[PDB]
Each structure stands twice: as structure tokens, then as C-alpha cells.
Amino acid sequence: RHSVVRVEGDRAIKQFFPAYRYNFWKEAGFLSLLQEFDFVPRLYSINPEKLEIEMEFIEGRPIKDVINELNSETIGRILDICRKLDVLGIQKEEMNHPDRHIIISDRIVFIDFERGVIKCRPSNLTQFAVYLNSRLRLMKNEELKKLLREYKKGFDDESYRELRTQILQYM
Amino acid sequence: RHSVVRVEGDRAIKQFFPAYRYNFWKEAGFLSLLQEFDFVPRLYSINPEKLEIEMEFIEGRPIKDVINELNSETIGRILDICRKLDVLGIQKEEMNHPDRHIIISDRIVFIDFERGVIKCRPSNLTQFAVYLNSRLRLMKNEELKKLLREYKKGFDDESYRELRTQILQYM
């Protein structure tokens, strides 16, 4: 609704509709701030006159196509990226509906940052954990909800490791 | 040392050395995230291959040239921008040496975001207050340090207003 992506070679061009200049800049800003990491597309150019962002085309399958086939190693890698975004202070949003926004090949790429916001304690990992439990039925809410409460309280490396192992044992 | 700025018409073009590629992305990222506000330059283009950013040239005088002539209303406007950055979670850095990075005309523009970082409680306002007191000698360190300690504890609008009025009274 906010934008259209067209693929031209190995580049994806995301053009926002004119009403959504605000989201255009958030996408450009957060992609720029995440270029030191390998879990976002490369950013090649921005054109505010056309509200166009030129970026790397990401080959692979969206998570919604493979979520039930994914092994524990791969899920752990996705949890690491959510945790990284938590630590960076970037709340990507809609991480409980990542169906079309995590692209899986030999690597894991997150796409679509146009709703990102800065926050002290982001909800990337716990939004994703709701999705993960919704698709894999790892456990009942009361157990998952307790696990998310403990991570949120501590919110350090130790709290994360406990959540990580306590999620992945279940698979 | 990180970059060279050249002015071509109404555009300032900043080119980084390759060693400072990640400062290029911070400048691009934070300028992008601040385009919804009027206190940064407009961003026009990025070129990651050349590490070049094209933005608005800002007409006006740097704060170091006018700091002792600035009235209380104008200082309050600069304090507001620091607070805004604090609230947004963006620590610009080097705000205790803003000498060439606040440009004052009819409006107030902050420039140079290449050292910015995200954090829960940024130090923009407490860094700027140290500079402000250093140039205007408004109060003794111990009093300022007491005022800054209280602002950092509360860190809400109320804490800010108390800081704001208690700074501006001295002129």
C-alpha cells in the first residue's frame, strides 16, 4: 500500500507513493544504518524526487514458504538477527508477521524497514517469537509469555542466551 | 580528517575516505531519519561507490562566531533541538564542541551526523550545556553538574523544562 518494488537485474527499486515520503526516509535511514551488517540488502542510491530506493535484489525464499522445514541452526540465526536489532535500538515493527520480510537462501536477509522506529528496548525478538511459536507450536502462550517477560526484564546477553536455548530445545 | 566538503551552488558535497565508510553511512542514515524535521540539511543523494553525500548548503554563521551575541530566545531554540535529538534516541556526539556544527541564520541547522549513535538517553543536551556554560560562563561547574545530574535522572519533559528555565535564567 505504501510502495511498489520492481526488479531490474540484480537490483530492486522500491518506489513509495507520494503520500508516503515519511516512510521513504525511514526505509533509507534504517537501511543506511544497517549497511555494516550482512542481514539487510545493500543500498545503492536514493532519489527523494521520485521517492525511489535502489537496493540489492535478494534471492531466496520468503520465510512463509519454508518455516516448517527450517532446522534449529537456521532458526537460531534468525533469533540472532532479531536480538542484534534489539541491541542496536531499532524496532523494525511487524516482526510477528515476518512472512514476506525474511528471505532465506544460504544466508538470512531482513527486508522492509519503512516502519522502523528507534526504541530503548525494541520488540523484534519477542514479536518474532510469537510468530515462531504460532507456526511451530513449540509451547503454549503461558510458557512463551513467561519466557518473553524474563528476557525483557534483563535484556542483556545472558537473558538472550537463556531465551535462545529455551526456544531451540523445543524443536 | 574523515571527509572533505565542497560547496557547489546551493549544494554541499561531502566525500569520505574509504577508511570512514561507516561514518558515511551514519551521516546518510541519521540525515535520512531527520528529514522529517527542519533542523538538518535536506539530503539529495548518496553515492556509496565514491562515499559522497549531496545535501543542502546551509547559509548562515557557525555558532562559534555569534555565541556571545545570541539572545535567550535563540539559546532556548538550540536547547530544544538538543532535547529533540535526546528524545529521538540519537546521540550526535561532540555536542560539547559544536563550534562549527550549529549554523545560525534566521533558522538553526545542525550539521555533521557522521559520528552519531543510537542510545536510550543521549547526551546532546548535557554536552551542549557544558559548551554553553564554557562560553557564557553562566554558572559554576558544580551547579551545572548538579543541574545536568537531575535532568539525566528524570529525562522527561518536566525534567527538561526545569533544566531549560534554570539555564536561561542566567542571561
Side-chain angles (χ1 to χ4, degrees), chain B residues 137-153:
Chain B
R137 285 185 29 160
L138 278 174
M139 87 183 67
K140 204 22 172 293
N141 228 1
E142 277 328 324
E143 178 62 19
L144 176 66
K145 274 150 64 53
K146 175 202 306 192
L147 291 203
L148 296 186
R149 263 169 236 140
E150 217 67 62
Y151 168 70
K152 274 310 235 303
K153 252 199 289 223

PDB file of all heavy atoms in Angstrom, chain B residues 137-153:
ATOM      1  N   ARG B 137      29.854  31.455  30.562  1.00  0.00           N
ATOM      2  CA  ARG B 137      30.183  31.350  31.986  1.00  0.00           C
ATOM      3  C   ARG B 137      28.976  31.690  32.856  1.00  0.00           C
ATOM      4  O   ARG B 137      29.005  32.581  33.707  1.00  0.00           O
ATOM      5  CB  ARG B 137      31.398  32.207  32.326  1.00  0.00           C
ATOM      6  CG  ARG B 137      32.676  31.532  31.825  1.00  0.00           C
ATOM      7  CD  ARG B 137      33.912  32.267  32.247  1.00  0.00           C
ATOM      8  NE  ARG B 137      33.662  32.955  33.503  1.00  0.00           N
ATOM      9  CZ  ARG B 137      34.614  33.375  34.321  1.00  0.00           C
ATOM     10  NH1 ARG B 137      35.890  33.124  34.082  1.00  0.00           N
ATOM     11  NH2 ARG B 137      34.272  33.993  35.449  1.00  0.00           N
ATOM     12  N   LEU B 138      27.891  30.965  32.598  1.00  0.00           N
ATOM     13  CA  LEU B 138      26.603  31.259  33.205  1.00  0.00           C
ATOM     14  C   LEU B 138      26.591  30.948  34.698  1.00  0.00           C
ATOM     15  O   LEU B 138      25.870  31.599  35.462  1.00  0.00           O
ATOM     16  CB  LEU B 138      25.515  30.444  32.508  1.00  0.00           C
ATOM     17  CG  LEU B 138      24.953  30.991  31.192  1.00  0.00           C
ATOM     18  CD1 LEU B 138      23.990  29.974  30.545  1.00  0.00           C
ATOM     19  CD2 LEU B 138      24.395  32.399  31.285  1.00  0.00           C
ATOM     20  N   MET B 139      27.388  29.973  35.130  1.00  0.00           N
ATOM     21  CA  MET B 139      27.275  29.369  36.451  1.00  0.00           C
ATOM     22  C   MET B 139      28.524  28.532  36.686  1.00  0.00           C
ATOM     23  O   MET B 139      29.247  28.206  35.742  1.00  0.00           O
ATOM     24  CB  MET B 139      25.988  28.539  36.524  1.00  0.00           C
ATOM     25  CG  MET B 139      26.136  27.098  36.030  1.00  0.00           C
ATOM     26  SD  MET B 139      24.577  26.173  36.062  1.00  0.00           S
ATOM     27  CE  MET B 139      23.625  27.034  34.808  1.00  0.00           C
ATOM     28  N   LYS B 140      28.778  28.182  37.944  1.00  0.00           N
ATOM     29  CA  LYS B 140      29.969  27.383  38.196  1.00  0.00           C
ATOM     30  C   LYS B 140      29.680  25.921  37.892  1.00  0.00           C
ATOM     31  O   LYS B 140      28.535  25.470  37.964  1.00  0.00           O
ATOM     32  CB  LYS B 140      30.475  27.554  39.632  1.00  0.00           C
ATOM     33  CG  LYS B 140      31.984  27.244  39.781  1.00  0.00           C
ATOM     34  CD  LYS B 140      32.731  27.380  38.431  1.00  0.00           C
ATOM     35  CE  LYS B 140      34.244  27.272  38.566  1.00  0.00           C
ATOM     36  NZ  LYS B 140      34.837  28.424  39.314  1.00  0.00           N
ATOM     37  N   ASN B 141      30.741  25.192  37.526  1.00  0.00           N
ATOM     38  CA  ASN B 141      30.658  23.782  37.158  1.00  0.00           C
ATOM     39  C   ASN B 141      29.759  22.990  38.096  1.00  0.00           C
ATOM     40  O   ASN B 141      28.827  22.316  37.652  1.00  0.00           O
ATOM     41  CB  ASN B 141      32.066  23.177  37.127  1.00  0.00           C
ATOM     42  CG  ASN B 141      32.328  22.376  35.873  1.00  0.00           C
ATOM     43  OD1 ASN B 141      31.466  22.267  34.998  1.00  0.00           O
ATOM     44  ND2 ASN B 141      33.523  21.802  35.779  1.00  0.00           N
ATOM     45  N   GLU B 142      30.046  23.053  39.401  1.00  0.00           N
ATOM     46  CA  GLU B 142      29.299  22.257  40.372  1.00  0.00           C
ATOM     47  C   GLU B 142      27.796  22.488  40.273  1.00  0.00           C
ATOM     48  O   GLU B 142      27.009  21.542  40.402  1.00  0.00           O
ATOM     49  CB  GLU B 142      29.801  22.528  41.797  1.00  0.00           C
ATOM     50  CG  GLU B 142      31.062  21.729  42.218  1.00  0.00           C
ATOM     51  CD  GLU B 142      31.192  20.327  41.581  1.00  0.00           C
ATOM     52  OE1 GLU B 142      30.174  19.620  41.381  1.00  0.00           O
ATOM     53  OE2 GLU B 142      32.342  19.889  41.360  1.00  0.00           O
ATOM     54  N   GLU B 143      27.374  23.733  40.033  1.00  0.00           N
ATOM     55  CA  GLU B 143      25.945  23.982  39.870  1.00  0.00           C
ATOM     56  C   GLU B 143      25.440  23.356  38.577  1.00  0.00           C
ATOM     57  O   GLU B 143      24.411  22.669  38.566  1.00  0.00           O
ATOM     58  CB  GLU B 143      25.646  25.483  39.894  1.00  0.00           C
ATOM     59  CG  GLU B 143      24.164  25.811  39.684  1.00  0.00           C
ATOM     60  CD  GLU B 143      23.239  25.235  40.765  1.00  0.00           C
ATOM     61  OE1 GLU B 143      23.718  24.883  41.873  1.00  0.00           O
ATOM     62  OE2 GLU B 143      22.025  25.107  40.491  1.00  0.00           O
ATOM     63  N   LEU B 144      26.168  23.566  37.477  1.00  0.00           N
ATOM     64  CA  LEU B 144      25.783  22.954  36.210  1.00  0.00           C
ATOM     65  C   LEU B 144      25.757  21.432  36.318  1.00  0.00           C
ATOM     66  O   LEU B 144      24.827  20.782  35.822  1.00  0.00           O
ATOM     67  CB  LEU B 144      26.737  23.408  35.108  1.00  0.00           C
ATOM     68  CG  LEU B 144      26.495  22.757  33.749  1.00  0.00           C
ATOM     69  CD1 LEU B 144      25.146  23.195  33.197  1.00  0.00           C
ATOM     70  CD2 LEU B 144      27.624  23.099  32.778  1.00  0.00           C
ATOM     71  N   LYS B 145      26.771  20.849  36.970  1.00  0.00           N
ATOM     72  CA  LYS B 145      26.829  19.397  37.116  1.00  0.00           C
ATOM     73  C   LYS B 145      25.643  18.888  37.928  1.00  0.00           C
ATOM     74  O   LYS B 145      25.098  17.816  37.646  1.00  0.00           O
ATOM     75  CB  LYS B 145      28.148  18.998  37.775  1.00  0.00           C
ATOM     76  CG  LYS B 145      29.311  18.829  36.807  1.00  0.00           C
ATOM     77  CD  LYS B 145      30.630  19.159  37.494  1.00  0.00           C
ATOM     78  CE  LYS B 145      30.934  18.191  38.627  1.00  0.00           C
ATOM     79  NZ  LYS B 145      30.866  16.769  38.186  1.00  0.00           N
ATOM     80  N   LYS B 146      25.224  19.663  38.930  1.00  0.00           N
ATOM     81  CA  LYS B 146      24.016  19.325  39.673  1.00  0.00           C
ATOM     82  C   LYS B 146      22.781  19.395  38.773  1.00  0.00           C
ATOM     83  O   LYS B 146      21.939  18.487  38.792  1.00  0.00           O
ATOM     84  CB  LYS B 146      23.898  20.251  40.890  1.00  0.00           C
ATOM     85  CG  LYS B 146      22.621  20.099  41.687  1.00  0.00           C
ATOM     86  CD  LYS B 146      22.303  21.335  42.522  1.00  0.00           C
ATOM     87  CE  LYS B 146      23.465  21.730  43.423  1.00  0.00           C
ATOM     88  NZ  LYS B 146      23.075  22.763  44.441  1.00  0.00           N
ATOM     89  N   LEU B 147      22.674  20.448  37.955  1.00  0.00           N
ATOM     90  CA  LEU B 147      21.535  20.578  37.047  1.00  0.00           C
ATOM     91  C   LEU B 147      21.505  19.447  36.028  1.00  0.00           C
ATOM     92  O   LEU B 147      20.434  18.922  35.699  1.00  0.00           O
ATOM     93  CB  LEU B 147      21.589  21.928  36.329  1.00  0.00           C
ATOM     94  CG  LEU B 147      21.350  23.197  37.160  1.00  0.00           C
ATOM     95  CD1 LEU B 147      20.881  24.338  36.269  1.00  0.00           C
ATOM     96  CD2 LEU B 147      20.333  22.938  38.257  1.00  0.00           C
ATOM     97  N   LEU B 148      22.673  19.081  35.492  1.00  0.00           N
ATOM     98  CA  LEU B 148      22.730  18.022  34.488  1.00  0.00           C
ATOM     99  C   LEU B 148      22.457  16.657  35.103  1.00  0.00           C
ATOM    100  O   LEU B 148      21.862  15.788  34.455  1.00  0.00           O
ATOM    101  CB  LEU B 148      24.091  18.041  33.802  1.00  0.00           C
ATOM    102  CG  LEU B 148      24.311  19.336  33.018  1.00  0.00           C
ATOM    103  CD1 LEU B 148      25.596  19.249  32.228  1.00  0.00           C
ATOM    104  CD2 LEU B 148      23.110  19.590  32.105  1.00  0.00           C
ATOM    105  N   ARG B 149      22.904  16.439  36.339  1.00  0.00           N
ATOM    106  CA  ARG B 149      22.605  15.176  37.005  1.00  0.00           C
ATOM    107  C   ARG B 149      21.103  14.983  37.145  1.00  0.00           C
ATOM    108  O   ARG B 149      20.593  13.878  36.931  1.00  0.00           O
ATOM    109  CB  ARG B 149      23.259  15.117  38.389  1.00  0.00           C
ATOM    110  CG  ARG B 149      24.587  14.385  38.452  1.00  0.00           C
ATOM    111  CD  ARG B 149      25.257  14.623  39.800  1.00  0.00           C
ATOM    112  NE  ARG B 149      26.602  15.170  39.670  1.00  0.00           N
ATOM    113  CZ  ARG B 149      27.107  16.108  40.461  1.00  0.00           C
ATOM    114  NH1 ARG B 149      26.420  16.592  41.484  1.00  0.00           N
ATOM    115  NH2 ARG B 149      28.333  16.569  40.222  1.00  0.00           N
ATOM    116  N   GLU B 150      20.378  16.052  37.486  1.00  0.00           N
ATOM    117  CA  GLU B 150      18.938  15.933  37.685  1.00  0.00           C
ATOM    118  C   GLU B 150      18.214  15.679  36.370  1.00  0.00           C
ATOM    119  O   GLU B 150      17.318  14.829  36.303  1.00  0.00           O
ATOM    120  CB  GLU B 150      18.399  17.195  38.357  1.00  0.00           C
ATOM    121  CG  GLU B 150      17.295  16.922  39.347  1.00  0.00           C
ATOM    122  CD  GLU B 150      17.789  16.159  40.553  1.00  0.00           C
ATOM    123  OE1 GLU B 150      18.652  16.695  41.280  1.00  0.00           O
ATOM    124  OE2 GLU B 150      17.343  15.006  40.744  1.00  0.00           O
ATOM    125  N   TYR B 151      18.601  16.388  35.309  1.00  0.00           N
ATOM    126  CA  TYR B 151      17.988  16.152  34.006  1.00  0.00           C
ATOM    127  C   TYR B 151      18.164  14.705  33.551  1.00  0.00           C
ATOM    128  O   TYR B 151      17.221  14.088  33.044  1.00  0.00           O
ATOM    129  CB  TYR B 151      18.570  17.104  32.968  1.00  0.00           C
ATOM    130  CG  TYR B 151      18.192  16.724  31.556  1.00  0.00           C
ATOM    131  CD1 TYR B 151      16.886  16.868  31.106  1.00  0.00           C
ATOM    132  CD2 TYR B 151      19.133  16.180  30.685  1.00  0.00           C
ATOM    133  CE1 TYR B 151      16.529  16.502  29.824  1.00  0.00           C
ATOM    134  CE2 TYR B 151      18.786  15.810  29.407  1.00  0.00           C
ATOM    135  CZ  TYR B 151      17.486  15.969  28.976  1.00  0.00           C
ATOM    136  OH  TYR B 151      17.151  15.608  27.692  1.00  0.00           O
ATOM    137  N   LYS B 152      19.377  14.158  33.689  1.00  0.00           N
ATOM    138  CA  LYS B 152      19.628  12.793  33.236  1.00  0.00           C
ATOM    139  C   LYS B 152      18.818  11.781  34.042  1.00  0.00           C
ATOM    140  O   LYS B 152      18.419  10.738  33.500  1.00  0.00           O
ATOM    141  CB  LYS B 152      21.122  12.479  33.310  1.00  0.00           C
ATOM    142  CG  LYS B 152      21.908  12.906  32.078  1.00  0.00           C
ATOM    143  CD  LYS B 152      21.244  12.420  30.790  1.00  0.00           C
ATOM    144  CE  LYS B 152      22.205  11.608  29.933  1.00  0.00           C
ATOM    145  NZ  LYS B 152      23.429  12.423  29.609  1.00  0.00           N
ATOM    146  N   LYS B 153      18.584  12.057  35.334  1.00  0.00           N
ATOM    147  CA  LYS B 153      17.762  11.162  36.152  1.00  0.00           C
ATOM    148  C   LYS B 153      16.318  11.125  35.663  1.00  0.00           C
ATOM    149  O   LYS B 153      15.776  10.048  35.385  1.00  0.00           O
ATOM    150  CB  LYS B 153      17.810  11.562  37.628  1.00  0.00           C
ATOM    151  CG  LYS B 153      18.620  10.598  38.482  1.00  0.00           C
ATOM    152  CD  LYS B 153      18.290  10.723  39.968  1.00  0.00           C
ATOM    153  CE  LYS B 153      18.819  12.018  40.570  1.00  0.00           C
ATOM    154  NZ  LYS B 153      19.438  11.782  41.907  1.00  0.00           N
TER     155      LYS B 153
END
